[PDB]
Amino acid sequence: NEIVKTTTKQRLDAYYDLELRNSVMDDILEMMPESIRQKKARTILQHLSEAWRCWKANIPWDVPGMPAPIKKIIERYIKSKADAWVSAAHYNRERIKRGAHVEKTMVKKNLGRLTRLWIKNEQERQRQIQKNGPEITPEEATTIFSVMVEWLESRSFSPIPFPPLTYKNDTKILVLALEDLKDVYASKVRLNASEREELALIEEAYDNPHDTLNRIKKYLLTQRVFKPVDITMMENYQNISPVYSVDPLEKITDAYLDQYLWYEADQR
């Protein structure tokens, strides 16, 4: 009746949770004065797990009214869990790239761990040049701009105009930018909310070309704050790749601007 289960590769996560959780609760019960545990012992650890999600989301774990040493011990234990988590992500990555027996679920877990680490490095890399820098000196920037003015005037380059209300090749640029978009949606069957919504936007753009061109040129004039970009991080087993799922209203006018900028760069 005392079948006790040894920790195989299904129970690194759960038994490591019980390990770290018992360690943290013994640390708080050591630290806290004269408190008999009935209910509070169950709940302080929730802050711990809150902090771990705050570490996974890279949100600063600021809880108002927490004591100083409890915040310290929770930060250092989630840093311990972070060290084991990151080293396990490295071990799984060079387990995939060796080409050995890697589980499918461990591959999806490794996708998730590596995209959390990638966006964490991305947030720190944005946040450093927010805090100090930026890395380009003003003299470098002026020499860059000076040699670009020198090149674009040595080539007598006239600037690309804004596309007028009555641009000549305009509906052909539009049907190219929409055939670029329906090339994704010609063969697939499974359609979520955003793909179905943007396919309805393409069908509505085919139903009205002139309202679409006025919508696009109005957005190029006036709109300067845009709906955010989801990333999804598809897997190639040597290296993951960022996949930027842009908003459905934005990709029509951005594909139009891509077509227009490439055509007006190659004409000039």
């Binding site: 709940t43 409890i70 927010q130 003015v149």
Partner: protein, 52 residues
């Protein structure tokens, strides 16, 4: 007096709660953009001197 453990991701017992319980720069950008404006002025001073 430890706070009573409200978080965003997991509401285990389905409690609703008060909404607030759920939820500068280096100088160098001033060094860049000003200088770029300066270079742009020089560009507009040079090219318009050649357009006469």
């Amino acid at each position: 007096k430890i706070p009573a453990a409200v978080s965003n991701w997991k509401n285990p017992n389905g409690y609703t709660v008060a909404l607030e319980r759920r939820v500068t720069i280096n100088d160098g950008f001033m060094k860049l953009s000003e200088a770029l404006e300066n270079a742009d002025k020089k560009a507009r001073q040079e090219i318009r001197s050649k357009m006469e």
